[PDB]
Amino acid sequence: KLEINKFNYNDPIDGINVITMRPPRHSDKINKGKGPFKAFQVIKNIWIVPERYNFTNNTNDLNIPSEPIMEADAIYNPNYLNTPSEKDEFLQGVIKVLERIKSKPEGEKLLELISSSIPLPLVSNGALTLSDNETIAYQENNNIVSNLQANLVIYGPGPDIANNATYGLYSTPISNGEGTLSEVSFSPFYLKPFDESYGNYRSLVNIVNKFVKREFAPDPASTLMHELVHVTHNLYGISNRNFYYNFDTGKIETSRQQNSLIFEELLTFGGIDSKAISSLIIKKIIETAKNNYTTLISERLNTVTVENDLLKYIKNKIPVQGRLGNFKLDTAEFEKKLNTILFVLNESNLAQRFSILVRKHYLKERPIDPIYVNILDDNSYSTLEGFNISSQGSNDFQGQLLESSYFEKIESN
Ligand SMILES: [Zn+2]
* Mode of pairing for the β-strands spanning 152-155 and 182-185: parallel
Q: In the chain, what is the greatest distance between 2 CA atoms, to the nearest angstrom?
A: 78
Q: How far is the CA of 36 from the centre of ligand 1 (A)?
A: 28
Other Cβ atoms less than 10 A from the Cβ of 127: the count is 16
Q: Which method, experimentally, gave rise to this model?
A: X-ray
Q: How far is the CA of 141 from the centre of ligand 1 (A)?
A: 37
Other Cβ atoms less than 10 A from the Cβ of 266: the count is 24
- DSSP lists the bridge partners of residue 322 as none
C-beta separation of 9 from 88 below 8 A: yes
C-beta separation of 306 from 202 below 8 A: no
**Amino acid letter, residue 93:** G
The yes-or-no answer on residue 140 being catalytic is no
Q: Output the CA–CA distances (angstroms, integers) from residue 324 to 127, 321, 327, 336, in the order listed.
A: 12, 10, 6, 23
The angle subtended at Cα 4 by Cα 7 and Cα 345, nearest 5°, is 130
Closest Cα partner for 356 from 104, 43, 4, 2?
Answer: 104
Q: How far is the CA of 385 from the centre of ligand 1 (A)?
A: 23
The angle subtended at Cα 407 by Cα 403 and Cα 412, nearest 5°, is 105
C-beta separation of 226 from 269 below 8 A: yes
C-beta separation of 218 from 347 below 8 A: no
Q: Output the CA–CA distances (angstroms, integers) from residue 96 to 222, 323, 384, in the order listed.
A: 13, 43, 10
- DSSP lists the bridge partners of residue 196 as 214
Catalytic residue among 227, 264, 347, 385: 227
Q: How far is the CA of 152 from the centre of ligand 1 (A)?
A: 16
